[PDB]
Each structure stands twice: as structure tokens, then as C-alpha cells.
Amino acid sequence: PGVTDRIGQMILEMFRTGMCLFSVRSPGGVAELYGGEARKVEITGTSLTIEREDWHLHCKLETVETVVFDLSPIRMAVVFRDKHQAPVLRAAWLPRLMPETPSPPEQFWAFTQRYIDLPMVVDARNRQLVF
């Protein structure tokens, strides 16, 4: 509901920064999507759709049960999980795609901080790595 709103918003925000690698995983394949500029964005009900010229991402936000904020040795990822804990979607931040200043972990901390409010969020951020 309102969570689904927030989730969608979080995904749209991450996308537009252009610093993220979005990945969708089936039982035998994974798709990796880059970009920060959409030809089309759409939130119809509980469905999120992002369209670039040569890739489209469709997400069923209602399936999302947990959101993991990972920051470990350094990987910075946000992981959207099924009700059976299966990843429906993964957003990984990449330092190569991120300005030198501030520090990549600072940028990612600053972002995740806006969102730790959410009940289904699960904080796995190693703060010691940011400061």
C-alpha cells in the first residue's frame, strides 16, 4: 500500500541517480541494467515500469516483503526480497559510476538514511565502513 508507494519511490530515486546497476534474476539467468535516464516511467497500481530505449524493467511491488540495505566488504546494494526470501530485484551502487567526492559509502549511507524508517527494511549496513 503506502509501503508499495515508498518502495516504488525508492526504486525511482535510485534509478535516476544513474549510479546503480539493476539486476533481475531467473533460475538460470540474470539481467543487468544500467542508466539514469528513462524514456518512460510508470506506476500503475502496484506495478512499477521503467523503460529505456533498449531495456525495460517491470516490477510487481506487491510481491516485495523485505528490503535489505547491504554495505559490506566494499559492496553497496539494496535488495528487494520475495515472501520466500527470493530476490525479485537488486540495486547495486558502483563507485565507477559515482563521483569521487563525497566518498561512495557516504553517498550510499546518506541515501539509505532517508529510508531506514520503513518497517520491512533490514539494516545490514556496516557503519564503520562509512566513517
Place this chain on the structure above:
Amino acid sequence: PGVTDRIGQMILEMFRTGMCLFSVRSPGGVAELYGGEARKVEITGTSLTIEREDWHLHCKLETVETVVFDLSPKDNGGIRMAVVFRDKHQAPVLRAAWLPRLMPETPSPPEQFWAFTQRYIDLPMVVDARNRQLVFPG
């Protein structure tokens, strides 16, 4: 083995036609990939990798148990031309859909799709669910 080589060969050839939509499906998301020119292609044992400027596809060919060739009418009207790679549980691991808008106007999309897939019909793991009527009225 040599099978794995042909599966990979098939995916690559479909990609190179540029008339396909590849899709990968998680339990609550699907990515749809377009284009027919890669900057980088890579085969590593049973893994295939296709990279364009803003998307990469990785496929663990070993998980492919059956390849469904589907040519059949959609309910909304229109013709479905898809290749579906499925694992041991019939979970789709990858899908290549063919798109009339990205294909020549002649011969008919159904004929082009038929000719391409026919080349692979002898593969033991292929499941031929193409309706012949849509190509050869008879």
C-alpha cells in the same frame, strides 16, 4: 556438451538478428532486453554473456532442460512467436520473443520464425509447439 554449444549458438543468432526481445523473469520482476549488436560476447564453459552499452545478459546454459518453440495465435489477436528456455521444473530461465515490428514485412513473420527454428528442431531437448497451419495453410 555439444548441445550446450548449440543452445548458446541459438541464443546468439537470435540476438544478432536484432528482431528479438529477450526477457528474464524473477518471482516479481521481469527485464526485457532489446538490440542486435553487442560490444562484448563471452562464453565460459556453460555460461554465455552478452553485453550492450547499458545492459548485460548472463545465462547459465547448464540449467536449460528444454527449449520450447512456440508459434501460435494470441487471444488479443495476433501471433505469438517465442522461444522459451526452461529448467527441470519448467521455470523459464530465459525467453526470446520475436517482434513483427522489428522484422521485414516479407516473408511473413511466421515464415521467418519457422525457417529459423526449423534449423534446431533436431535437438533432442527442443519441444516443437509451433502450429504449422500459420505457415502452411492446409
